[PDB]
Each structure stands twice: as C-alpha cells, then as structure tokens.
Amino acid sequence: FEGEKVFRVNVEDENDISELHELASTRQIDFWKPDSVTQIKPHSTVDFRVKAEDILAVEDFLEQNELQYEVLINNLRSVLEAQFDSVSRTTGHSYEKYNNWETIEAWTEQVTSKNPDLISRSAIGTTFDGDNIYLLKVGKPGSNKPAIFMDCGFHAREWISQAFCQWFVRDAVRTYGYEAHMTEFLDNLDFYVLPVLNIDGYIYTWTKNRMWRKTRSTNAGSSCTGTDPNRNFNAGWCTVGASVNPCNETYCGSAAESEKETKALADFIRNNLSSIKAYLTIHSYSQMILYPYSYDYKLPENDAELNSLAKGAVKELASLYGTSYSYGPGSTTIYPAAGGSDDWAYNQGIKYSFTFELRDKGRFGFVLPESQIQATCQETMLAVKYVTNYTLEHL
C-alpha cells in the first residue's frame, strides 16, 4: 500500500455523482464511505482509496472537473504500519490488541472454561471455507430468559468491530457480582455474542488483503469471490442499492441467505425468535447509530421510540470522551440499501434493531490503531448498557 492515498471528495449535485461513475469505470477506486458510487447522494462527502499508480490521474480528473477534494491519508503504508501499536508484550490474546482468528477461536474456548457459570459456547454452523461459527451465550443460566443478540465482524476489514464483541465479554465477566446493573442484566437476560460473523474474510484481511470486506465464497461463471453479508438478507433482498455482479463489493449474493454464514445466523435467530428482544450489529467506521429502514423510505411504527433511544444512547456514549455520534433511519441517514440484517431482524418482530458504526470519522477509517481499542470500547459499552437497560424495562 506504499504511496496509496485516501481521498475525501465533496459532491454537490447529481452531475458530480455521474462524473464519479465515469471515474470509477476508468480507475479501480476502493470506496470506504459510502460503500459504492451508486450510494452517493448530493451534498455529501465520499471517502475512497486510490492505487499508487492512479494517484496523478485522479487528482487531475477531480481538478479538471471541479470536484473539491481533500487527502485524508497521504500514505496508507504508514497507517498500516502504525496500526499494531499495542503497548502489550503478549504473543497471545489481548483485549487491547487485534487478535487473528486462531487467537480468537482459542479465546472463545478459554473464556468459556474459565467462566463456565456465566458463559456457554456453540457453533451455529460452518463458514464457506469450513471454519466454525462460534456463538457465546452470556448470562446466568435461567428458566425462560429474554435475550439480546449482538454480532461483530460482518465486514472483514472493520477490525474494531471484532475487537468490541471481545471487550464486551470481558466486561460482562469482570463486573458480575460487582456492578449492580451488569449483574442484574446477566441475571435477567442472556446475551448472545457472535464475535466474528465473516471468519473467512477476516482471515483473508490478515493473510492477503487488509482491505477486503465480503465473504470468501466462490461465484459461478466468474473468478470473482464473495457476497456482501449485509446485502444477503431477506429484507427487500437486492431490490435497491445492491448489485448482481459478483465482482462488485455490493454483490447481494445469488439468493437471499445464499451464504452459509448468513443462513446460520438467520436460522439461529429464527429458532430463538420468541426470546430475542433486541438485535445489535457492530460495524465501522463513521460514528453513527442506524435503525430501520435501509431498504425503504418507510419509517418503522416504532420510529419515535427508536429515535429517542438512539438519541439517549449517543448522549451516554459521549460522556466518556466527548465522541460525537449521529443517528437516524438508514435510508435517509445514508441512502437506501436492501438485504441488511438490522432490517430483516426488525421485520421478524424484533422491535429494537440497531447498527452501530464505530470510530473514527475518517482519520484512519478502517485502519484504526490498537491504541484506540480500549477508549473506543469503553464508550460503546455505555451506549450498549443504556439500551440493555432500556429493553429490560420494556420486555
């Protein structure tokens, strides 16, 4: 990634957008936010990364076409090297460093051995490459308890996400029998934590390409690999904001629940549907909290409640470090996109469905350094406990 840059471009009107369709059709641009050219709306900003060889061609195009730009990241290489900056001496699992999957997979086992009373572990299926999808069920085991489902690592390159589901499990165990609310939550609820949905991708971002997002499944008729897991749900499946071309990053898959991974999660949730009261899905970057709908401009019945709950949670979050989040329904907060899990869980009847986009807001983007793991996870924990406490009192 030596000499590659990340740009922030502003787009004023629809001609600006169609000018960026022509750019994209001519250079290989990696869109960071939004996740495709097709999801840009006027009067907004677009973050994307450009290959070293393309830097001058793109800075001419923007200039010659009046697109006002800023260089977010001058050398991605540096940012990639600053990444692993944990002041931890440990070769194994740390909560304050980014763990590879071998290391995560062994952690799920160890943490279950060490806190058998509070933690239980399953494999809810197997990934494309045959990796096991582990789910941890966190709670004081009880007759007929309501649940909260939380997953991380749907998109391979959003590593802070993966880091969060681990932190959560560490706190849930540390503050049991010491923190009043956390002890009552684990008594009253179970938490289902799926620390990594897209394992195959995650390993690919470790081994080959840090910037990968999709699954690693093979596509018929093409040598292009992967579906976007957050387009592969049966919520308006592929009807807007999603491609049928497998070589796109927004490839919606060949059918709803075409991925093994997303079929496992969808099935697990459906089998438990009467317990699970809330659905939380952790992504990165940009500091937002989204709630349904993304597939449509229609508002959920619930809208006013979800809106106030989001506003409260984002108010909690900021307490610690002053971190600003924004929130709203996904379609107008961003742009319509079909097949996401939040919209699907909601349409299953789960009234409280959120996506969180953690830090930052583009200084590092996906390539957030290990040094910001902990602060990031502490403030999120504050929005997470708030909403848990909300749901508990509305069961």
Ligand SMILES: [Zn+2]
């Ligand atoms: Zn994501």
